[PDB]
Amino acid sequence: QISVRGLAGVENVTELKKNFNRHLHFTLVKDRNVATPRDYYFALAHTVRDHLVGRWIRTQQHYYEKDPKRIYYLSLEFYMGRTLQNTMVNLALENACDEATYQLGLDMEELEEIEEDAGLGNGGLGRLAACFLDSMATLGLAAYGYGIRYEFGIFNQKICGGWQMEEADDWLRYGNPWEKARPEFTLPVHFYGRVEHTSQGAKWVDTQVVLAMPYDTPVPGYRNNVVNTMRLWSAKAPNDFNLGYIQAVLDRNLAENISRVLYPNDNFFEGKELRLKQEYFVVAATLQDIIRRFKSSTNFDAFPDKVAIQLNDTHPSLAIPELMRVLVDLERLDWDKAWEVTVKTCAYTNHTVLPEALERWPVHLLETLLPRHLQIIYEINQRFLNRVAAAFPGDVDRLRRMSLVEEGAVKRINMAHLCIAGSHAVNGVARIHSEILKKTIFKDFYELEPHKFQNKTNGITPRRWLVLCNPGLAEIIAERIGEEYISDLDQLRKLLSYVDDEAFIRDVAKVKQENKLKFAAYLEREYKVHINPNSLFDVQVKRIHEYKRQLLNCLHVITLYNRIKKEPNKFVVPRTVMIGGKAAPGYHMAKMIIKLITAIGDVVNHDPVVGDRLRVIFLENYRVSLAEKVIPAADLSEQISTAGTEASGTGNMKFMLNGALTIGTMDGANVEMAEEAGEENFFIFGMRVEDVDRLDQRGYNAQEYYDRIPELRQIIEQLSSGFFSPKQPDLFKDIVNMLMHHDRFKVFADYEEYVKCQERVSALYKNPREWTRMVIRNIATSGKFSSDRTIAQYAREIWGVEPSRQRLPA
Amino acid sequence: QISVRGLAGVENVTELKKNFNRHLHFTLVKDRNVATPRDYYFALAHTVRDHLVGRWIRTQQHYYEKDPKRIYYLSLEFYMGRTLQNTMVNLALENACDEATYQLGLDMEELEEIEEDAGLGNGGLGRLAACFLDSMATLGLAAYGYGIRYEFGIFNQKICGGWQMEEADDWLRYGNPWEKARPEFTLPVHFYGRVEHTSQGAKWVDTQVVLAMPYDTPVPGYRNNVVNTMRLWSAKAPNDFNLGYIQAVLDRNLAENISRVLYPNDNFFEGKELRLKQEYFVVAATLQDIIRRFKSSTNFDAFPDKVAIQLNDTHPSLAIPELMRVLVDLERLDWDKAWEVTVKTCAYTNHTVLPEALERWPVHLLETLLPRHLQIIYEINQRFLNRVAAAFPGDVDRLRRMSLVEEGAVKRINMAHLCIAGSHAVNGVARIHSEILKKTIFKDFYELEPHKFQNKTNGITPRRWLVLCNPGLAEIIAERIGEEYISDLDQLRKLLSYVDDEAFIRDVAKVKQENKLKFAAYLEREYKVHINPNSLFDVQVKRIHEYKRQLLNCLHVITLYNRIKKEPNKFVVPRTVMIGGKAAPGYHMAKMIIKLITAIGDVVNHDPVVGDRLRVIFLENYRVSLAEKVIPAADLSEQISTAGTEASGTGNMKFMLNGALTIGTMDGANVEMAEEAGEENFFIFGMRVEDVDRLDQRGYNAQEYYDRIPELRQIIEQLSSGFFSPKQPDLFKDIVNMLMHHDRFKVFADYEEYVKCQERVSALYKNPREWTRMVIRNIATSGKFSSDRTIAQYAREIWGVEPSRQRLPA
Ligand SMILES: O=c1[nH]cnc2c1ncn2[C@@H]1O[C@@H](COP(=O)(O)O)[C@@H](O)[C@H]1O
Ligand SMILES: O=c1[nH]cnc2c1ncn2[C@@H]1O[C@@H](COP(=O)(O)O)[C@@H](O)[C@H]1O
Ligand SMILES: N[C@@H]1[C@@H](O)[C@H](O)[C@@H](CO)O[C@H]1c1nc(-c2ccccc2)c[nH]1
Ligand SMILES: N[C@@H]1[C@@H](O)[C@H](O)[C@@H](CO)O[C@H]1c1nc(-c2ccccc2)c[nH]1
Ligand SMILES: *Cc1c(COP(=O)(O)O)cnc(C)c1O
Ligand SMILES: *Cc1c(COP(=O)(O)O)cnc(C)c1O
């Protein structure tokens, strides 16, 4: 149908058809008379998977032969989403598969909807890991993603009576055709035990053993025949575990629980023993695999020339002391040599400055679970502080601040300090964030070792986030500038030559309109909700958090409602306000925010005076597959975190690529997006980081805003008095109390500027030609936010390897 | 190579080779440079599986179209063993696969050794279920085996310091290529709750739900293109189960434990709640499947014309009240109509008379777990006893004896009484056993309803237990009488015409010798033990039990040792005495018997005066795959249970088919084997059932035998004084005390006759020509013991269906 989906040649189509029928019969053991759509989805998935296999085998062979430097990306989260469409796009099979299925009487788009998301992450951090794998394969890097194969990924969200309920995400129920179990490469991981000091060094003895069994998933690059590996570990008890008899067998679950469930917290640290087990499990299995592969290619001096380990936040920080353990206790290197190797091998990416998200493990947990690692951490700390003392003599407070060990009621290990000490590179994830790291929380470390500190601004893959989710936009772009932009997104700048072209303006607006109609129908079909597709689609999708300020959006929505009720016969630009996202199950305030959003909807959506001028919809079960549907449909992207709190953001970049304008604060990557597009093409409002600091110095008093802004006072009185909860008048008192007395994120302080900025948005939306011209200016300057750019920078500036766009032979 | 293994045609061989390479590449994702023997085994298994699929689909289609009466064989155990070779034999692919693999540079016999046994049974009962499935498919019956897919089958046995240690049987670790998950046919099963009585009958409410997910395994018939289904249920928690968050997800194990592990007791009842859950789980899921299939083919009068349910012992006895529950509570049939349907549908096979093996569930367990089923059981009981009272007026003791409810400290339900009441047919498993049922434990029931009581003597499949395990014997038979005997084992009678044929005598002896050499080499390779292959191979393999009298064998072995030590320079026929079998983990005396056997070996095998004249070997990890190796190698089969205790036995029949002579008591099927072969061709000894009864009436006094038999006294003094345990002189005191004071199985009472009979065995072994002629007489008369015969009798006399040897089209 469309050019960017590839060729549908007669021989290709014939072969796909016969292999589809082969898999239905032999693999699924069904005849066509009782096959369901799910059976047809599996038969297609197996057919497409067969095309990956030859390339996967050849790619891994090529790495064994050439022996390039290997990149190991360690993460507790890989938020992959669905695989079928992405695989077809990357192998140029989409049009052929569409045709093959069409000729068999099937609708491929319907089959695609049957696939479960692989939901092995919480949000941005996990999704970044997934985008990075796609870019590393596309850039020809010998890269491996290592993680945990959780049996249960991020929970499915149901809304009941306006409240979030959680259900287990049993994503493997029907099988996962993309993975290959490799039980032959199972490795042991040790826990508990004690340390014995012999004459030939330390020995970690009397341990409990859990086995780590790997499952491998192919990661195809874009049209280059490179297929890399994501290796995910699953926990298995040994066969003599606990070995009355029946109970001993049932108690194997105690070991296997390590890989059972993803911790469902976004940007928050929960210091539970099971989480610590997960972190060590992934590190210990991965490092054995790395060392095996290195030995099969005695002399560890070359280790950093052949291996890079990238730590995705501090979650895999135990890699540092584990590498030291292996090199010192098992390989018998002297400490100084081992430390040199470790530092040159490891690099640390920080993704947050919120204090509640920083990992600080109690010493007593590490002492019991990982006694040798604790000894190694203490030794690292002593040697590190000896360097600090020599550089800054007499500065005793600096020694306390920089210590890996935090004093207090409970002594804790600061994992970020460990990562900085043991890594040759430390980066933040947007320019403003990397500057904040150097000026505030890691200032001391920067003064000691300025050379370590870098920036690598985040990005998103344009394969999933343009070609896959918005083929109509990809096509109209390709008609003008060709297809090369898909792996070289900077070529979108060429679109600035079309900003005055009437045909292009029309086509851009037409694609948005089609995406809106398609999303409005999806809503009606799957959720029985009716929306006006001529309205401005105002969208805030992201995890529910105080710092992300869904509450500020709520205040604007109520302001609009109150303005309509005051002057009902005045024209206002119609809006559909859509908010979606999961709350962590234990995060009470986030759960209350969801309830407020649905409660506002219950009033606004049923007021006959409002009509179709304002609708408030809570989008249930926000996840990667839903992002792919809603983001192409959005007109306005809400990126409204308090300045200094969102390290980068990546949803922001997805919306920019897909033809939404952005209303946002100067936070995270929003700063760089505005710089690329021009501030005149962005709806910037609110306090900058410097203004937040000035307010904190004099003291934030929310009462002052309440006293001075009548529209704000009215909303608080409505919340307090039960206007949005007539049967439970005090339902929102915790929200009111927080806003008035304990608001760390200064919602009221940005309210006036936010409302005024929203009025400018509405004014521009009234002039569709100028709205669309501004959109073109945003899409055209979005090239910097390709994860291909991000990964090329990591490769050159951190890993010491050169990217390549050259194809392997087919 | 040999004719009974089929044709190796050029086109077949070419196609197997290309499909093998296809599976290695696409299914296993390996290239030949790193493939292991395990990868090659899987590639062959997938290649062979592909040939089953078309036949499986066609067979199940044919049943949907023709709508024959369906046979449902319900069992807690299916002891399947390995599948690869059996599938090749039944599809006539063995020679083609041998050739195809040979041309690829691989040895198929080595690949076959990699496959795990499917060990989902304890011994005879589970293995009978497996033989029956093979015979039902071979006889063209629309039959389904229904059971539980245990994650852990019968434990792997290790011997350490002469003691049994247990290890989990992680049989699914590398995957199971034979099964197909069918998550789309998942069904709910209810537990706990309470009963509400409305105006429209009873309702079982407030239950906990566990999901039953089926896995289907193909069951090929012998060369007839019929492939039936074994459907095994696996337990899954619903997604809202327990739905802080993390703990709720981890607690899904409480539901999923139902299918985790096989209870490892043979011929013994352990009344644990988990076992009861297992029994209901299999019944409840199975019955829904049965009813679904019946409705898709309102009027339950035709139910018994379309459905037969065979209960494999009382383990699935809850089928009776579950069927009543469904028909009365859900379909709203009146009680009397429902009961008529139930009785005509169900039939019960009893497999034991040992009191400790009979299921008697405490009422309090059923009251909590299955409250509606308990109410239905009480109603069945009241109506049943009303019939008894009308037939035998005033016989109040008979009412107490026949009640389904047993009075006492703890009230219990007698499940055997429930099965008799609710079944149209009740059978035992050998003639002597079925007579014992009518004369002793079910005498009262027989007097009320004599028409219900039948015999169906057990059998074994000649596919696995001759063709597969002893191809050399199968071939020399086939050279004389053709191949038809493999599905019509009565044709072996034709071999009586060859009993004086010198060439046949030579060939029979040569095959045995080859099997002995092959087994003697296996022992050396896998277990570092050396045996004399010219010795008489004296074999007792079966689960370790007091009633099976491994101890009587032990007394004979010590007698032989003592006779050698007394007269070392006298000739004795050399023997290798092999004993193997698993002990239930909680069965202390069985564990002590294993220790005694290894302790005897430690003395006998290292005494230089004995030399190679006597060796005692404990065969570790006895299981179906080991039976296939040792049984073809045996000269003497030990079948020495106390008369009246072994319901049938089936190992006995395996040995007869494979050219061993039998030393045995007149117990179980030994009686019928002796009758078929002639008593002159069998080594019969010991008390008959009648002699056991006479001894019980006057009182068994073991001291009398000790006082009268000096050789026996010497052995007991050796045991007591630490001759076989010098470092722990009192190690065997429990064994001595049991033999002298509390022996229910009268070991001493059969000792003298056993030893004398063993002397006759040795005398015959000295004359190889006459030994071999007696062997031919046994093999020739073994035809009655085909499970094809057994199944034809069930089909005609119980199920009301006609067997068929006609082939479906290929
Ligand atoms: O010893 C070897 N001989 C031949 N090829 C090897 C060997 N070791 C690794 N390879 C190749 O590279 C491997 C990739 O797996 P890895 O061990 O995870 O790196 C295999 O799939 C082979 O293609
Ligand atoms: O509604 C139907 N239409 C066509 N074929 C059916 C239908 N129901 C069952 N079958 C056939 O018989 C089935 C065997 O599965 P069953 O439901 O377990 O008996 C399928 O595999 C079909 O081949
Ligand atoms: N909030 C940032 C977000 O601004 C950023 O775009 C994303 C990727 O760098 O990482 C997110 C992030 N997620 C975590 C996180 C996730 C799970 C557990 C603990 C921390 C820390 N940081
Ligand atoms: N001992 C008989 C044996 O004589 C008989 O050959 C076999 C098959 O009928 O069934 C065995 C049997 N096994 C059980 C059993 C198995 C597991 C749990 C409880 C009872 C009962 N009966
Ligand atoms: C991109 C993405 C995120 C991150 O969005 P932010 O607005 O940067 O927090 C979270 N969840 C999903 C499902 C995503 O695709
Ligand atoms: C046949 C068989 C049995 C039953 O043997 P009996 O001597 O009848 O108790 C037990 N276990 C295995 C592995 C078998 O093949």
mmCIF file with all atom_site columns, C-alpha atoms and ligand atoms in Angstrom, chain A residues 31 33-34, chain B residues 57 60-61 64 70 144 231 292-293, ligand 2:
data_model
loop_
_atom_site.group_PDB
_atom_site.id
_atom_site.type_symbol
_atom_site.label_atom_id
_atom_site.label_alt_id
_atom_site.label_comp_id
_atom_site.label_asym_id
_atom_site.label_entity_id
_atom_site.label_seq_id
_atom_site.pdbx_PDB_ins_code
_atom_site.Cartn_x
_atom_site.Cartn_y
_atom_site.Cartn_z
_atom_site.occupancy
_atom_site.B_iso_or_equiv
_atom_site.pdbx_formal_charge
_atom_site.auth_seq_id
_atom_site.auth_comp_id
_atom_site.auth_asym_id
_atom_site.auth_atom_id
_atom_site.pdbx_PDB_model_num
ATOM   1  C CA  . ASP A 1 31  ? -6.874  -26.995 11.132 1.00 0.00 ? 31  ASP A CA  1
ATOM   2  C CA  . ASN A 1 33  ? -11.999 -25.036 10.740 1.00 0.00 ? 33  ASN A CA  1
ATOM   3  C CA  . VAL A 1 34  ? -11.336 -24.396 14.478 1.00 0.00 ? 34  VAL A CA  1
ATOM   4  C CA  . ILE B 1 57  ? -5.638  -33.812 13.507 1.00 0.00 ? 57  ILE B CA  1
ATOM   5  C CA  . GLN B 1 60  ? -9.753  -36.130 16.185 1.00 0.00 ? 60  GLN B CA  1
ATOM   6  C CA  . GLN B 1 61  ? -11.719 -34.861 13.123 1.00 0.00 ? 61  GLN B CA  1
ATOM   7  C CA  . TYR B 1 64  ? -16.111 -35.377 15.673 1.00 0.00 ? 64  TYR B CA  1
ATOM   8  C CA  . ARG B 1 70  ? -16.028 -41.944 23.950 1.00 0.00 ? 70  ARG B CA  1
ATOM   9  C CA  . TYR B 1 144 ? -8.818  -40.131 26.112 1.00 0.00 ? 144 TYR B CA  1
ATOM   10 C CA  . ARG B 1 231 ? -4.850  -34.523 28.236 1.00 0.00 ? 231 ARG B CA  1
ATOM   11 C CA  . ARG B 1 292 ? -18.682 -29.854 26.688 1.00 0.00 ? 292 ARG B CA  1
ATOM   12 C CA  . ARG B 1 293 ? -17.809 -32.520 24.112 1.00 0.00 ? 293 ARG B CA  1
HETATM 13 O O1  . LIG C 2 .   ? -17.564 -26.670 15.990 1.00 0.00 ? 2   LIG C O1  1
HETATM 14 C C1  . LIG C 2 .   ? -16.748 -27.360 15.342 1.00 0.00 ? 2   LIG C C1  1
HETATM 15 N N1  . LIG C 2 .   ? -16.602 -27.219 14.012 1.00 0.00 ? 2   LIG C N1  1
HETATM 16 C C2  . LIG C 2 .   ? -15.719 -27.964 13.304 1.00 0.00 ? 2   LIG C C2  1
HETATM 17 N N2  . LIG C 2 .   ? -14.921 -28.903 13.870 1.00 0.00 ? 2   LIG C N2  1
HETATM 18 C C3  . LIG C 2 .   ? -14.965 -29.154 15.209 1.00 0.00 ? 2   LIG C C3  1
HETATM 19 C C4  . LIG C 2 .   ? -15.906 -28.367 16.032 1.00 0.00 ? 2   LIG C C4  1
HETATM 20 N N3  . LIG C 2 .   ? -15.767 -28.787 17.295 1.00 0.00 ? 2   LIG C N3  1
HETATM 21 C C5  . LIG C 2 .   ? -14.825 -29.756 17.293 1.00 0.00 ? 2   LIG C C5  1
HETATM 22 N N4  . LIG C 2 .   ? -14.325 -29.987 16.045 1.00 0.00 ? 2   LIG C N4  1
HETATM 23 C C6  . LIG C 2 .   ? -13.264 -30.970 15.627 1.00 0.00 ? 2   LIG C C6  1
HETATM 24 O O2  . LIG C 2 .   ? -12.899 -31.855 16.689 1.00 0.00 ? 2   LIG C O2  1
HETATM 25 C C7  . LIG C 2 .   ? -12.019 -31.119 17.561 1.00 0.00 ? 2   LIG C C7  1
HETATM 26 C C8  . LIG C 2 .   ? -11.254 -32.017 18.533 1.00 0.00 ? 2   LIG C C8  1
HETATM 27 O O3  . LIG C 2 .   ? -11.251 -31.325 19.795 1.00 0.00 ? 2   LIG C O3  1
HETATM 28 P P1  . LIG C 2 .   ? -12.266 -31.567 21.035 1.00 0.00 ? 2   LIG C P1  1
HETATM 29 O O4  . LIG C 2 .   ? -13.100 -30.318 21.165 1.00 0.00 ? 2   LIG C O4  1
HETATM 30 O O5  . LIG C 2 .   ? -11.264 -31.762 22.143 1.00 0.00 ? 2   LIG C O5  1
HETATM 31 O O6  . LIG C 2 .   ? -13.111 -32.779 20.718 1.00 0.00 ? 2   LIG C O6  1
HETATM 32 C C9  . LIG C 2 .   ? -11.236 -30.140 16.674 1.00 0.00 ? 2   LIG C C9  1
HETATM 33 O O7  . LIG C 2 .   ? -9.818  -30.355 16.622 1.00 0.00 ? 2   LIG C O7  1
HETATM 34 C C10 . LIG C 2 .   ? -11.946 -30.252 15.322 1.00 0.00 ? 2   LIG C C10 1
HETATM 35 O O8  . LIG C 2 .   ? -11.177 -30.984 14.361 1.00 0.00 ? 2   LIG C O8  1
#
